[PDB]
Amino acid sequence: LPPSDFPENALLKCIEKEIEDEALRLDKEECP
Amino acid sequence: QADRRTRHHMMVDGQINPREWFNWHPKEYQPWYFDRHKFLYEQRQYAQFHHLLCHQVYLKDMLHLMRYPEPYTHIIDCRTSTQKMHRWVPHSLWLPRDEVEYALQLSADEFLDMYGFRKPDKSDDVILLSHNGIYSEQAGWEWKKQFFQHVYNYRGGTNELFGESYSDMNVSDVLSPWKGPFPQSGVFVDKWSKRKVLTRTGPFDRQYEMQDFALPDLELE
Amino acid sequence: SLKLILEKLSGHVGRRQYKMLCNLEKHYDKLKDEGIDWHELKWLSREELIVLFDKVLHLTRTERAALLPAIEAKVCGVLRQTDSRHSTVVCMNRGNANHGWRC
Amino acid sequence: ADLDRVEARSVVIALNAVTNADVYEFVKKYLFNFGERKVKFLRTTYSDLRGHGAGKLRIPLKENDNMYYHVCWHSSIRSPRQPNAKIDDIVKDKIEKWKAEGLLPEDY
Amino acid sequence: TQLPDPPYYLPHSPRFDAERCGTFNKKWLLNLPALKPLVRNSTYLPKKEELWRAPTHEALETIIGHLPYHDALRYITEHSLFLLFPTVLRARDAPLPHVIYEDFMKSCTFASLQNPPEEQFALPSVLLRTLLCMAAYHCTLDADYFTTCQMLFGRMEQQQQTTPEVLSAWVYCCTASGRVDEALTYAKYMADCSAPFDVTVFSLMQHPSLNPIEVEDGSVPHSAKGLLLQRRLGNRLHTAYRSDAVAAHGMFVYYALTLSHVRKWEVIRAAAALGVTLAERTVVLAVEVFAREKGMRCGPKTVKALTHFLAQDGTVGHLLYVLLRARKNELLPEFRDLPHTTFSEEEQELVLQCVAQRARHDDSFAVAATLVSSLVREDDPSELLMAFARAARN
Amino acid sequence: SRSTVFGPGSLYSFTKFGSFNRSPTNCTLNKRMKDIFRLENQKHIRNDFDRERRYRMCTKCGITTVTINFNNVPSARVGLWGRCADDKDYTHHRMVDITQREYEVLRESPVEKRLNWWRYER
Amino acid sequence: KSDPAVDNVAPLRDED
Amino acid sequence: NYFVMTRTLKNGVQSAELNNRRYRSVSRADVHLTVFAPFRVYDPSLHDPTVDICEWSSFDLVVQKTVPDNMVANKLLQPLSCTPQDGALSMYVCLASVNSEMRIRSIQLLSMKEAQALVEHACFGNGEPLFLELLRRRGRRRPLVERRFDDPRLRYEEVAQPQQVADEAAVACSSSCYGPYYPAFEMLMDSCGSAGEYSRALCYGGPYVSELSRELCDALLDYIKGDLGVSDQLCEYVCQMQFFLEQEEYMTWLGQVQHVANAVSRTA
Amino acid sequence: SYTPNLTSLTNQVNRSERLRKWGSAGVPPGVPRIPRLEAKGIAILHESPKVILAGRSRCNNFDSNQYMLINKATKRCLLVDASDDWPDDWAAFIGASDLTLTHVFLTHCHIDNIINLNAFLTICGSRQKQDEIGVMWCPAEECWVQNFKRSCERYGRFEEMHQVLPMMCRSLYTPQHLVDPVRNARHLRRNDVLLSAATNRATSFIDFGNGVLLYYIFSPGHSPGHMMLHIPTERILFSGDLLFFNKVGRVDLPWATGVRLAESLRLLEALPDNTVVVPGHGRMTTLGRERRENKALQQCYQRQEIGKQEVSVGFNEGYL
Amino acid sequence: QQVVYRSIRDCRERAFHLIQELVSSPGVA
Amino acid sequence: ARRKWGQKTWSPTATNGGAAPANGVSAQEALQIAYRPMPPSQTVEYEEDFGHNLMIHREYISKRCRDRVSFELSALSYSNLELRRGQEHLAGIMNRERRGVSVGASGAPDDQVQMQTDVDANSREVLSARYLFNERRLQFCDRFQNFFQSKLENSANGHEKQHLFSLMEACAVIFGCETEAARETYYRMFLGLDSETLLEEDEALRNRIADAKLVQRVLENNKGNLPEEFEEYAPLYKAYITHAVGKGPVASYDISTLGSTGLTAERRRWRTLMEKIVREDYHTMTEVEQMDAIVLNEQLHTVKFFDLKIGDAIRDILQLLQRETGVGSSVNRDTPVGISPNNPERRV
Amino acid sequence: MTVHGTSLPSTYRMHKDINKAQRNDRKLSGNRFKVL
Ligand SMILES: [Zn+2]
Ligand SMILES: [Zn+2]
Ligand SMILES: [Zn+2]
Ligand SMILES: [Zn+2]
């Protein structure tokens, strides 16, 4: 994500953070 | 019409939270005397200009100067709107109000070229008129800004001389009820002080006083 | 009790202090000259209110609309006690016909 | 003349007989010439000569309510607290706009 | 004592002498040593007994004016004296006018006397016009201020009242920054809203000196005749035209007096492209500046704009001179690298139809409609000019 | 209170708390302590190349400044704690631009050597 | 174009 | 009861207002904005005095993206999901103004997929029984003449530009990969009425924003205010324009009381 | 009260309030000094193998209390909230106990806490003359230091008006005076510590000696900087103005927020019930009795349970 | 705008009018 | 992650002084607090090297604020005019802070002087507008007066008068000081005679002289008749020359530079006289110094009554609004109401 | 009446009239449930 081409680096890096810690948490169940 | 609610965010405090943050405090403001009946520049907000108020010439003085004029008592009309003037005050010269702050900056020759009459001397008597005496009062303040020793104002000039019912149409700029004012939209102050300035005690048509400090009355109880 | 209810229905309302446009305080003198009370106003039937509003009171259609929530709920005109000696608190509870519309 | 030291029953009788509209506007501007002690005494004298003390006069006063309310208004004031052509031009083009837009329809 | 003259390329004529006001004069530089004892005397404070016996308004204005800016704002906010706001505009350390507007609104916020908020937080339009005219003088000095001025306007229209005074001051702000198109478009929006252009902003726009704080103070006593002339010219132009033509005339005179001739011709370009009907005084002034400059600083679309405005309202000789100078500058060896002015078919038909409409009533247009049609269609035989000279001599 | 509304001493007056030391009277440190606290030697701007860098030099007190991303955030508060030649403000600098290469050879020199290099060399 | 109820200039003009 | 404003950012976000201001004297897909603003303004401090809110005004923001033919750098490295040919992904940001402070109500991501899901297989084998019935009663509104309170700089440049970009997407979505589900998507993206509010409530509705992380709450506000351009200046303008156009509609209401009362008196 | 500007002088409601509150006088009677009559002696409240707490109740007409902690080993004493109308009994007590006064702890800088502070420091330093006494305080109370004179204006404390407060003098945290080369009683006070608002259970303590640690807790709401003392080995919580017997502190004074007071009451729930809470005013209680029988904490936790995001609690009539 | 019709012939004639309207508005490259 | 209301996830301690160590923080720990992870698209970083030490400066201004934040809170300068003025606006705010603490609180006890004031509520007369001096300053005051009473009682405004009182009172405040940083703030309160402003006037004077030599170089080289002190006219002459040749759109009309050569020479003569009395060297005075002593004594007498005349003006408004309403009363008039007193047809 | 300009019954009436909104507005009905 180059800042010259992508001005939304505060959101795209924050949402890439929020993908991982919603999957890396162990409190969630995979099965319904 | 039809009692438009206004888009200001003033509000009275509730019945649940305590009264806090007393480095700003609104209270109701009631002065001693009514000033709404008075002349516009004799009211409360123009008291500091009280020594700047021109001396009043009256109706009988104006009729005496109509009958028996003096060579250096200059009667000067300060009305601006040409569509609202229908008669001529005798011995009067037209110097409209909105040009006065430029007109007194000229020399005598430039005054004669730009107005067609000679510039009055600073010791000559100058007498100003308007519809209500409002444009003539501002023009008298502009004439007293320059060093003119004798400046007089006929309050209610044309409306008492010719018996007309006109006005100078002063706006007295009041915000439209869609215009949201400054302290609602802004981070100029902290949130406690912003919440405590925007509060008021009672309806928002009257006047209020803002206290910058308060101490608790420990001697009551 | 009739005076304070008509005073509150004409004053400012709410946290934003919305002024009530219709002044119901002008009809207070003609209501007490007839000898009718706020508790006696709740005892009047529907047909006795149309006679009272049109003939005696001359209540307009917007002044009738600002007074009718006070008559629809049958507010009990009882002065509540307060921290001061002069009380301006009327009980705003809805009255019942078994207890004389006193709630 | 000493306007403050005129007899107060004399002023309120002469002011009671003002009914014409042009002289009523004269009394409004003239009543500022009295003092504040005088104009609060004219209200108490006018209210008494039309009220309980109406027997002090030889001939009773006539009911002038527009001068009674204005003297009572003026005494409270002196005491401390305790472009039609261009506007009508704008209205006509708006009704012209609503007929063209269809907000004011014709006969159905 | 021989100083050079700045090249305004303004016409020397008694008609446009009001346009010659705003020109700096070396006569004032010669008059300058006479004023030196006066300004040397004015630097001293009055005595204590005179200042203690002074009236209230005079003492307030002479103490708050000498005081620091934030201390004067504190005194105003403490004693709720809002009428001393034009004094603290003139302070010795006052910031740029957007900061002063924020300080004015802050002083109205924390004031000791709180009116109802529809009248408490409303500044007078004279104050807002003075603030925006200071901003426009700074944009004349430095154009990159304009962005903040836009932000300033983005608050003022949301907080104060949008009057024609502040809108004309914002048009002057956009003009002084070099922004030609949006200034004329704001002027056209005022003209469609039937708002009159302010005459003091129209006079200050054609005076690109004289920051208005010392104009309302009056430290420059001369050139008030020029200010009155420009105000009366603005009133005369508004009697028969809309606000956009008056604003475009002010833009033209401002860009002529600031030696920015490219924006001066961009004014005419944008006024023809937008649809603003220019006043006849502005068209005659543009033709005489074109004559002074010999068509050097000009483009093809500016030539098309001038010919459209001359066919709409203009004499035959002005249009013929503009077309002949354009055709001669096309043939000059200097401008051979630059492209030639070519009329597309629709605008050519429009110009020729307006010329034929003028020529049905005018004989001076009917005698030269064929020469105009030959000059626009780019085929110009010299026999037409020879017959024109023969008819002029005979 | 109303006395603390307009600065000095206001709410958002960020210079009312105190001043910096700006003196060699304490913490005599070496060249490695300057190298570890360089802006240019940090990780987050070593791989940053699209923001613009400006290298300037004062000719009065002889300091070397580098500013990055000033075109996007042009804060006028930047450098307010500069304290030029003899307890003067940072309005007294009169900075002149220098290149990247001659910033590195002048960063290690003391202020008198920088002023002598400016006056008698280049 | 005005019709005033009272006037102070006109009775002084009419005698002259 | 409403007014719609549009804004088209060419070459993506980087041509917005905040990203272009700099200090002087020293590609991507285009974004189409749409702010629907009804006249729904109320104060909740009347019904509940414990709430310190002076004004609550709701207005919806629809942001769509459109790929042009001029971008060469990142054309076919991934399928673009914002394209109307591929999903027609669009973000529906329900916004609000709480005492001239813009607060987000919901952030919904709607495509033609969940419009196809609601019409065909929202139940076990069928669609929603209320969403299918609401599409069975869809009558057009009579054509109202619109008034153009544009930005002054773009007032005289182009007039039919919000109409052209509305028909650019409507052609591209109706002839897209999802063809017969576009009337279900028109009622889904219809911001005026109760049928569109129930249709968007059948979708997810986004996470409840106060439960999100503080880093995501500030980055979403930095995107909408700073990057997307939907600012507090725009938010405060909508509260002003809801007040001004209510005043304009009161005068036409006064013109229609007079027009009705004059037509009766000349008839009786 | 506040500064009499033009708007306050032309207001009739101001004269109406000054007639309603104070009758025909119109001027508020101040808070005077307690005379030598009706004054009690210093009581020894607590005796322990580690420390000794000696206090005096109702030492002001603000009805504040004065406490001193004595280390039994090091013979060092510590005054907390130094406000006594007679700091001559305390200096005689320190001199007859062979104690050394090294620091004075200040919870907050209201006038009911720092009224006789210069008198304490002067008399105890004069007895030490036959190292000076330091002051421990939070810098947010700087905003209440500058209004010490104004508070001395309204409460009639005229003899304490023209006194430079020792917290205003140059400490080691401040720049030094550049005196002429040709004094240190007032120019520099090296014994001065500024407490930080980041208070933790690890390192936010004062080493009183003999292994006794005094943890200061940052708890605003009655003041911008308000520091409680907590001694966990002795189960003693000098609360100051945060918590009293059946009541809490005022919020109707400037720089006082109700939600800060609610957070300050919420940061107190991890202490045991047998912790004797020692307030700045009135009688002392325990934290368990305040968890059971105090209505302000009941309202705070009830508003927290029913879902108030900004719980605001606080008194409007009580102790300053 | 949307207009509702009663037959098939008027729809065809309106569609041909729309064809003539779209071809008289500018002819493609 | 996403948080829930009322449910918090507990996290272990680092066991290093808590979150903020009260004992101290080393250089490598504070290096990470220095280069804290701000978003770099909206962050400006700046460092300056000043010989031995260097100072780091990092500012981040968010994206959700720049439409509503104040121009003073977020001091963004999008032009070089805003850079030079925004720094100079923040110059005086910081300079008054670091100077004002030397004489108020946190000042030396010899550098703190107070004024006593008392104004009568009825007569509006200032009673006892004195200074509060110590015993050292009062010995300087009577050393001043006993010398000047011995010189001015034989010849020549009464017996009980204080000769050059507002000059020695302004010099007694400076005499009793012990810090030079608190001395220069009193020189700024007394007409701005501090060395900060006098070196500012000396810098603008030498800049005008250097510009006077440039206009003299241009007018001699162009032609190859002038006013006397051309350095006052040279900012006005050079502003026209750049406007004339084409580089600049504005010529200047500001005449504030005129008379500044004689003005700044008087200010440094005022300052040299103020230092001459503090060192008690008033036993001989040149005639040029005696004319400056009379002028500066009246100039210093009116600057100490700026605040007292402000409160005097508010006390005018207080007695104004208590006046009797109306046009007046017939008891308290010398003139009939409807005419001027100077009317020839006065008595009907 | 001389010094303060009013009398104590009028003072009590003015004090009761200046703060009429924040004395009593509603009776605050309803029930608050535990949310945790
Ligand atoms: Zn009841
Ligand atoms: Zn420097
Ligand atoms: Zn306290
Ligand atoms: Zn306390």
Contact B15 L26 (CB under 8 A): yes
Residues of L in contact with K8 (CB under 8 A): none
H130: Cβ contacts below 8 Å, ≥ 6 apart:
H198
Is the Cβ–Cβ distance between K324 and D38 less than 8 Å? no
Tokens linked to H135:
């599409």
What residues does I238 pair with on adjacent strands? Answer: I229, I278
* 3-state secondary structure at position F55: strand
Is the Cβ–Cβ distance between I148 and I165 less than 8 Å? yes
C-alpha to C-alpha distance for D58 and H155, rounded to whole angstroms: 80
Tokens linked to K18:
């808590």
Beta strands I192-194 and I134-137: pairing type? parallel
C-alpha to C-alpha distance for E177 and K272, rounded to whole angstroms: 48
Closest-CA residue of D relative to K337 is D33
Tokens linked to K32:
């990470």
Q: I137 alpha carbon to ligand 4 midpoint, in Å?
A: 15
Nearest to E67 by CA among E94, E41, E40, E43: E94
Burial class (CB in 10 A: 0-12, 13-18, 19+), L28: exposed
Tokens linked to D6:
């005129």
C-alpha to C-alpha distance for K174 and K168, rounded to whole angstroms: 10
C-alpha to C-alpha distance for J14 and J23, rounded to whole angstroms: 14
Q: C77 alpha carbon to ligand 1 midpoint, in Å?
A: 7
C-alpha to C-alpha distance for E216 and D52, rounded to whole angstroms: 64
Closest-CA residue of H relative to A18 is H216
* 3-state secondary structure at position B175: coil
- Helix, strand, coil distribution of chain C in percent, nearest 5: 45, 10, 45
Is the Cβ–Cβ distance between B39 and B50 less than 8 Å? no
Is the Cβ–Cβ distance between B181 and E117 less than 8 Å? yes
Obtained via which technique? cryo-EM
Contact D35 K329 (CB under 8 A): yes
C-alpha to C-alpha distance for D97 and E366, rounded to whole angstroms: 42
* 3-state secondary structure at position H24: coil
**Phi and psi at residue F84, to the nearest 5°:** -65, -175
Burial class (CB in 10 A: 0-12, 13-18, 19+), E313: middle
With an 8 Å CB cutoff and a minimum of 3 pairs, decide whether chains K and H touch. Answer: yes
Report B:82-111 residues touching E (Cβ under 8 A): 99, 101-103, 105-106, 110
Q: F79 alpha carbon to ligand 2 midpoint, in Å?
A: 11
Is the Cβ–Cβ distance between F60 and F84 less than 8 Å? yes
Tokens linked to C60:
């307009």
Write the DSSP symbol of residue I236.
E
E62, amino acid identity: T
Nearest to F93 by CA among E353, B111, K46: K46
Nearest to F90 by CA among I197, K94, C29: K94
Closest-CA residue of B relative to L21 is B202
Contact F2 B212 (CB under 8 A): yes
Please tell me the distance in Å from B175's CA to the nearest CA on chain D: 20
K123, amino acid identity: S
C-alpha to C-alpha distance for H74 and A2, rounded to whole angstroms: 13
Is the Cβ–Cβ distance between I148 and I118 less than 8 Å? no
**Phi and psi at residue E88, to the nearest 5°:** -75, -10
Tokens linked to E322:
């503009």
Tokens linked to K293:
């002593």
- Distances, alpha carbon I262 to alpha carbons E324, H53, I221, I268, in Å: 86, 22, 7, 10
Burial class (CB in 10 A: 0-12, 13-18, 19+), B146: middle
Beta strands I205-209 and I227-231: pairing type? unpaired
C-alpha to C-alpha distance for B14 and L26, rounded to whole angstroms: 10
Q: What is the DSSP string of E251-286?
A: HHHHHHHTT-HHHHHHHHHHHHHHT----HHHHHHH
- Helix, strand, coil distribution of chain H in percent, nearest 5: 35, 20, 45
Is the Cβ–Cβ distance between C38 and C77 less than 8 Å? yes
C-alpha to C-alpha distance for A32 and B191, rounded to whole angstroms: 45
Is the Cβ–Cβ distance between B139 and B97 less than 8 Å? yes
Structure-derived torsion over alpha carbons of residues E224, E228, E234, E237, reported in degrees to the nearest 10: -140
Structure-derived torsion over alpha carbons of residues K220, K223, K225, K229, reported in degrees to the nearest 10: -30
C-alpha to C-alpha distance for E209 and J5, rounded to whole angstroms: 69
Residues of F in contact with E103 (CB under 8 A): 6
Contact H216 A15 (CB under 8 A): yes
- By the CB < 8 Å criterion, does L27 face chain C? yes
Return the residue matching tokens 């919000």. H162
**Strands (DSSP E) found in chain B:** 25-28, 55-56, 73-77, 92-94, 125-129, 151-153, 208-211
Instruction: Tell me which long-range contacts E45-54 makes (C-beta under 8 A, separation of at least 24).
Output: E45/K299, E45/K302, E45/K303, E46/K302, E47/K298, E47/K301, E47/K302, E48/K298, E48/K301, E48/K302, E48/K305, E51/K302, E51/K305, E51/K309, E52/K305, E52/K309, E52/K312, E54/K309
- By the CB < 8 Å criterion, does K6 face chain L? yes
**Phi and psi at residue D107, to the nearest 5°:** -70, 135
How would you classify residue I38: left for phi > 0, otherwise alpha for psi between -120 and 50, otherwise beta? left
C-alpha to C-alpha distance for D23 and E2, rounded to whole angstroms: 75
H113: Cβ contacts below 8 Å, ≥ 6 apart:
H87, H178
Q: Which ligand is nearest to the CA of F62?
A: 2
Return the residue matching tokens 């009329």. E343
C-alpha to C-alpha distance for K249 and K240, rounded to whole angstroms: 10
Strand order in B92-94's β-sheet?
Answer: B55-56, B151-153, B125-129, B73-77, B92-94
Annotated binding site of D for UTP, which residues?
9, 58
C-alpha to C-alpha distance for K297 and K161, rounded to whole angstroms: 14
What residues does B94 pair with on adjacent strands? Answer: B77
Nearest to E28 by CA among E216, E225, E222, E203: E222
* 3-state secondary structure at position H228: coil
Annotated binding site of F for Zn(2+), which residues?
58, 61, 84, 93
E76, amino acid identity: I
- By the CB < 8 Å criterion, does B211 face chain I? yes
Residues of E in contact with B208 (CB under 8 A): 114
Contact E1 K259 (CB under 8 A): no
Contact I179 K108 (CB under 8 A): yes
Report B:11-40 residues touching I (Cβ under 8 A): 17-23, 27-32
CB atoms inside a 10 Å sphere around CB H61 = 21
- Distances, alpha carbon E355 to alpha carbons B10, D65, E280, E310, E314, in Å: 63, 76, 17, 9, 10
* 3-state secondary structure at position E320: helix
CA angle K319, K325, K328 (to 5 degrees): 100
> Side-chain half-sphere of E61: how many Cα atoms within 13 Å?
15
Look at chain L and count its residues. 36
Q: C76 alpha carbon to ligand 1 midpoint, in Å?
A: 5
Nearest to E371 by CA among E381, E362, E361: E381
Q: Is the dihedral of CA K18, K20, K26, K28 positive or negative?
A: positive
Burial class (CB in 10 A: 0-12, 13-18, 19+), B196: buried
Q: Is the dihedral of CA E245, E250, E255, E256 positive or negative?
A: positive
- Distances, alpha carbon F52 to alpha carbons F45, F71, H23, in Å: 11, 7, 12
CA angle H240, H246, H249 (to 5 degrees): 145
What residues does I255 pair with on adjacent strands? Answer: none
C-alpha to C-alpha distance for E203 and E216, rounded to whole angstroms: 13
What is the distance of C-alpha I251 from the center of its chain? Answer: 16
**Phi and psi at residue B171, to the nearest 5°:** -75, -45
CB atoms inside a 10 Å sphere around CB E297 = 14
Nearest to B22 by CA among I320, E160, K144, E267: I320
Tokens linked to H115:
């419009």
Determine if the peptide bond prior to B183 is cis (ω within 30°): no
C-alpha to C-alpha distance for I66 and I91, rounded to whole angstroms: 13
Angle, to 10 degrees, between the axis of helix D84-101 and the axis of helix H232-265? 90
| Start-to-end C-alpha separation, chain G | 23
CA angle E266, E272, E273 (to 5 degrees): 85
Write the DSSP symbol of residue I88.
T
Residues of F in contact with B213 (CB under 8 A): 1
> Side-chain half-sphere of B155: how many Cα atoms within 13 Å?
10
List alpha helices for K127-164, DSSP H.
Answer: 135-152
Angle, to 10 degrees, between the axis of helix K135-152 and the axis of helix K165-175? 150
What residues does K127 pair with on adjacent strands? Answer: K118
Write the DSSP symbol of residue D56.
G
C-alpha to C-alpha distance for E5 and K219, rounded to whole angstroms: 14
Stated as kind and residue range, the H or E segment containing K22 is: none
* 3-state secondary structure at position B103: helix
Resolution, in Å, please?
3.1
Angle, to 10 degrees, between the axis of helix E280-293 and the axis of helix E316-330? 30
- Distances, alpha carbon I7 to alpha carbons B27, B46, B208, B210, K317, in Å: 11, 14, 9, 9, 11
* 3-state secondary structure at position I128: helix
Look at chain E and count its residues. 394
G8: Cβ contacts below 8 Å, ≥ 6 apart:
B59, B63, B160, B161, B162, B163
C-alpha to C-alpha distance for A6 and I57, rounded to whole angstroms: 68
Burial class (CB in 10 A: 0-12, 13-18, 19+), E143: middle
F113: Cβ contacts below 8 Å, ≥ 6 apart:
none
I100, amino acid identity: T
**Phi and psi at residue E260, to the nearest 5°:** -105, 85
Is the Cβ–Cβ distance between E13 and E288 less than 8 Å? yes
**Phi and psi at residue E234, to the nearest 5°:** -65, -40
Q: Is the dihedral of CA K206, K207, K213, K216 positive or negative?
A: negative
Is the Cβ–Cβ distance between E206 and E21 less than 8 Å? yes
How would you classify residue B219: left for phi > 0, otherwise alpha for psi between -120 and 50, otherwise beta? alpha
Burial class (CB in 10 A: 0-12, 13-18, 19+), K52: middle
Nearest to E356 by CA among E346, E343, E366, E364: E366
Tokens linked to H237:
């303008």
C-alpha to C-alpha distance for B39 and B138, rounded to whole angstroms: 13
* 3-state secondary structure at position I256: coil
What is the distance of C-alpha K60 from the center of its chain? Answer: 32
Write the DSSP symbol of residue E334.
S
Residues of A in contact with F51 (CB under 8 A): 3
C-alpha to C-alpha distance for F62 and E250, rounded to whole angstroms: 49
C-alpha to C-alpha distance for B78 and B80, rounded to whole angstroms: 6
Write the DSSP symbol of residue E13.
-
I61: Cβ contacts below 8 Å, ≥ 6 apart:
I31, I32, I33, I34, I85
Contact E224 B102 (CB under 8 A): yes
Closest-CA residue of E relative to H158 is E274
**Phi and psi at residue I64, to the nearest 5°:** -100, 170
Burial class (CB in 10 A: 0-12, 13-18, 19+), E271: buried
